[PDB]
Symmetry: D3
């Protein structure tokens, strides 16, 4: 192979998501940083082994790709597509670079973020900064276990990493991000049985509701899709809660990785636009998307060589 970035990371309990745009003239500064970001990851992380588990995944948007590089583009790379649904909208917001920084402790994330933004001062404009924290039993802001059906091992490699279909960019992946805010008051007004019907799984035990009872507009129903192959289409997610109690913000930061954006984009269409049997994903009646961006996360080797 070539070495991929740390897309398949161990379970980590803290994250920083940084989205920036590249200012006029910024391209050179950015190119230098990209070639050093792996060694900054080691500088910050190595001394905190082995509990640290610090990783940084760097992604580049469609328009930024063309400013930074010439030659081939990854096959799937385009701007995030707005979805204007009957009721709900998936918005598009600007973002040229993504840093998805993960570790077992927030401070490690922050130390690496500090170093990266230190090198980019003057070249970039911050668009989003989120400090995420996992709840102690892998629960999210809605109180459900979040992560359970993610693929693992070889299945994950198959679902997430670009291969032979675009061989110049093998080891890469496509990341979609959306920042969601929740109406927790509304959510907390449902009974548990009602909430389970929205998600499609049991709250306490995390056992999937049987097909005979799981609503067609439940989240798990609409995000299960089968390919042309008859095989299930999979993504790798690492959703993180965030918020502020003083400003009444409670949020889920969605990030989904896939070997092609077509998979992630299909799931999004089903959620926002609905199907024959479902107006839309019921989870969107409690969750509003306020950002939306798409990035390509190259193989590690690609970045080293600049």
């Amino acid at each position: 192979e070539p070495e991929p970035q740390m897309v398949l990371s161990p379970l980590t309990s803290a994250a920083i998501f940084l989205v920036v745009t590249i200012d006029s003239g910024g391209e050179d500064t950015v190119r230098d940083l990209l070639s050093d970001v792996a060694s900054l990851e080691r500088a910050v992380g190595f001394r905190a082994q082995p509990d640290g588990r610090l990783s940084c995944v760097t992604g580049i948007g469609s328009e930024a790709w063309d400013r930074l590089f010439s030659g081939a583009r990854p096959a799937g790379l385009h701007p995030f597509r707005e979805l204007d649904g009957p009721v709900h909208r998936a918005v598009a917001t600007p973002g040229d670079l993504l840093f998805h920084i993960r570790a077992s402790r927030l401070d490690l994330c922050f130390a690496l973020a500090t170093e990266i933004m230190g090198r980019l001062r003057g070249a970039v404009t911050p668009q989003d900064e989120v400090h995420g924290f996992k709840y102690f039993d892998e629960r999210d802001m809605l109180g459900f276990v979040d992560g359970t059906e993610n693929p693992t091992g070889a299945a994950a490699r198959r679902a997430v990493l670009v291969g032979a279909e675009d061989p110049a960019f093998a080891g890469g992946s496509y990341a979609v991000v959306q920042k969601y805010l929740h109406d927790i008051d509304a959510w907390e007004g449902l009974s548990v049985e009602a909430q389970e019907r929205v998600i499609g799984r049991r709250k306490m035990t995390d056992v999937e509701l049987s097909d005979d009872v799981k609503p067609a507009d439940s989240h798990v129903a609409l995000t299960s899709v089968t390919g042309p192959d008859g095989s299930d289409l999979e993504i790798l997610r690492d959703n993180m809660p965030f918020g502020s109690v003083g400003r009444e913000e409670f949020g889920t930061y969605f990030i989904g990785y896939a070997r092609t954006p077509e998979v992630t984009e299909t799931m999004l269409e089903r959620m926002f636009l609905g199907t024959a049997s479902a107006p839309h994903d019921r989870i969107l009646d409690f969750s509003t998307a306020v950002t939306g961006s798409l990035f390509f996360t190259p193989a590690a080797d690609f970045l080293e060589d600049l």
Copy 2:
């Protein structure tokens, strides 16, 4: 008698500091919450034993004290006193309640803060909310180990908890908070040897500089105070870094507990106003205080009733 709040907490790596003012008419909602805050601490924390190490310490300001209660006031409770130094200023900012929430993980802090603010929606106005994280070798935002000379065990009990000198309020303590922002660019322009001269200890090994070489305007020099009998006056600190990379905010949230505010206030006067030997604490040449408040943290029993 009394169970104190969890003022002497184990080392914890995450904190939420929440400072609020009480709206007119809010007093009753607040009173109910104060009587329940211990049981919220257990509800959220008990199931995360024993790694969770969740605690909440609740403090009440001088003006709010008068709105909430009648009868005795704690002897030492007054508003934070501004210090207008020749060069540096310690400001005073509004705050009626303090929640000092600590645990081994941020999410536990957040869950408890959510519960508290949920019960207070409509009664209070948030003034400050800070999510702190300790760096992995007890270092602070300036890269120095932070906490080393805090008292422990019986020395800490003696330094922090109100006793027989104000017996109605035994088990209590006085908390001073200041939010500091640092000029990291300036700081990182000093050599390590220069930084050590600012703090008064060695950066990598955390060994105190010897008396013959420690500057008089170093931080450790100015915050060492001896009482009339010649014994050292101590406080208990739990400084936490915080920040945002995007907005270039790099901060230290200072919190100091003491059995009387006179100790904390003296150290502050020495830092801001100087001594014969020292114009001011050199650490203030890299650190600006943007909040300042004083609270009394009652014994736990006091709140139960």
Copy 3:
């Protein structure tokens, strides 16, 4: 002076409860063992320090007391008082000796139990043996967090240990054990909101229900008692799940320590016989007591000197 047993133990995640009767002629063998039980706890436990957290608490029943010792009896010691409620029955079952063994691992518990019983074979007859385990995040078999409102530190010392009121036995405590079996099918038939009404706290978050809403026949309602003093009366509980899936046994092993049995017995009367405003504790509609015994757990120095 006196050093209590390890009644106030840290949280431990395994236990063995062993209840035996003394055969005729067994008294001398039991007396020798009682003087050695602390040294066996060291023999087994010391090598697994400090993770091990092995503790054995030894309790003696009312009629056993008279066969083993002459001199003073602890003031509160009598047989367990059977409760014959309108609906639900707290039975009293034989028990001369209790060994309440706790540790962070079952094998340490088992090792100690093996050594104790090895010395006592010939002289005792086992009546009950339960291997208990912690379930998830301090949850019991009904899926609720169990322990939350126990007292801690000074408050626990005062609620549990005999003092000046019985000075010959200061450092002692009274233990009540009852093995409960649950009807899981019935219980799972309830909505979560209905279950929360039975217990009197929220299931997921373990927040207590407000006075505004807490039923009077909720468990938390009936087991809250304020003394003549105006102060609450507290016990220390360390309930352990146990069971067998093949036999459909799902259980809670209740053990509660108190400085006098009057406290424990009142809570039991409220639960089984009811109050002015509540027939009986609704928890008993899904929980059957099949054992019941009371024991005195002497101070450690009492046992040493035999």
Copy 4:
């Protein structure tokens, strides 16, 4: 093809559940087999990564024929009784095996509860054992147990069906026997005598040298080389269990191998002896009270049902 979790990390707790399928139970069983992987995830995922919950499902010979039609695994037959001059290996009923392992008992128990909940009415329990690791991987006779198990690629090659039965590649054969030990007898031997029974040193777990290791020692009789001269290996995960009230001290034996021929050879040598050894001396202190053989299919085989 993805195998089941036969090669598991070291785990300190286990539940072994053996059941028979009632008449008419076959359809309920087939549904459960297709869901058992997702129950494993539901129960286990929230305790990652310390949980290490795994369930291996095995199917007996007669049950295989009730549940499926067409080709059978080449090696699948009922456990063969061994009627030795002194010691006997009995065969007991069992159609399905759930070998559930984790770092904590409660994860095992939660998964067993879910499985048996789906099978209520279709199956009858024959055996349920809750096993625990004892100290430092010791068994109930006080010896370290596991030391010579194969690891990594050697283990993959010893336990997984391959080319020799390609329709069932990814599978394995599990033999289970529940043993009870006569501890009184055992503890009457000196340590040196016990070492001669096992074939290794008690405290250090170093193998006895070939010049002193008896031919009727356990390690001697269970070391078997093929005609090509290579060692024939199995993967074991013996677990202690017991009840102190009943004076029951046991070892639950489970051995996995790519063909039952390997496991069965070792068994014949233990029970029936060799030219130079009447039987395995360990059987003078260990009685088998169960005996069953199961085929543990590749994971994909179960998914597609």
Copy 5:
């Protein structure tokens, strides 16, 4: 109390023992260091809390005490007394200062030792340096669990700390050190049953041999001594293995603390000189003492204020 030094330490798995003599003219350097040793302990240790468990206990010998201080002497302070037995001899070797440094990791021990010896360069001459490590189940070099019968809690405070019998020096203790080397070949030639008869406990299970079978010349027999009341006289031990495989050195570094040396010295006389019943402690047939020193470890306050 006055604050004692960390004589009662948790179980720690690494130690450095440093014994030095003070050169002529060294006295002042030494006095400065003694007043700073607690703050060096915090500097080195604080950043590794709470896994670190670094402690240093500082002791002063008889002749050094007179060079360093005027005022009272601790009542019990004298040079270690050589014991010239019929077969075995307890030697006395020079030592003015003892640093007993303990932590969960060797590097913390070493960092503190480096700081201390750095301040004393020029003033002192090293006599003994041992780096000790605990075997993984609290076993010593002879393969027995070592530490089992040590006192804990209040019993330990009573056994080790000076009180009202020498009130000027309350909070202090007396440390005896001896470095032993073992004849492992001889030892390994005994059966386990024979080794158990030497020590007086069971090897694998660490259960004491019963009084009716424990030999009078076993180690546990000769180091059990009762005071006038018939109460056991106890010390606190923290023996540490050490060794060098290339030089065939396998050793136990003995350190025992007591409130008066009379107790420790009694046990030593019994071991080396024997009694009416026992020629000498059989453990000495496999263990040779090559050092011997006695130190007083003052209360921490005493060192602060010089």
Copy 6:
């Protein structure tokens, strides 16, 4: 082909043992080599999983010739002395290397004891070092040590012999050098000067930028690009050691590579210098007192003797 445990997890304790084979000792050493894997398991198994005990056994050039029938690994020769204008890399005797690592020194010692137990009489100790990692991966000079080692596939490729010497695939080449430091001298430097010697920042471990990194910095000289254009990498596991009484503060260097050409190049650069650098400045505070090269065979090689 199964390698030894060259690529180990991070371990915080080590023993390095170097011996020579006495005349006539060769049969004894051959026996031990065939058992050393089973001794690693005897001692380590019971301490799973925290123990992480591993033993890597290396054989020198002249020992190879005395011990083995046929072909030699391509790269095996005696360590070549380097006689630089200022600093000298000495070559010292050593036939056998045991590189023992674990999370705790007692496991290391136990295994070392057992090995030397079998070898007493047949070998002569030349060096024995008990190493321990500082609490944040620091070496005796106070710098983080290990940061740029390769990982995973990159490491597998830089360390393990492949098809270029197919009889010995799975093997590796180890160079050891024991270094003693002049701490007094080194502590005389400012932090900025020390950073110039190493080529990275002290506290943060960030590499100095190319326009500030000296050419005689350690990181500068031990960066080597092949004829390939690609970086040439070794795998290091340097361990501090020492004795405070004797004023010895040391770094035990061990580097593995798939050919010694890589390690030897870096050594020439350090000791003999380049176009723009007299020698590695680190050698101005570090004296090598040993030097040997060994071949560490595949595990399978040793098993079959």
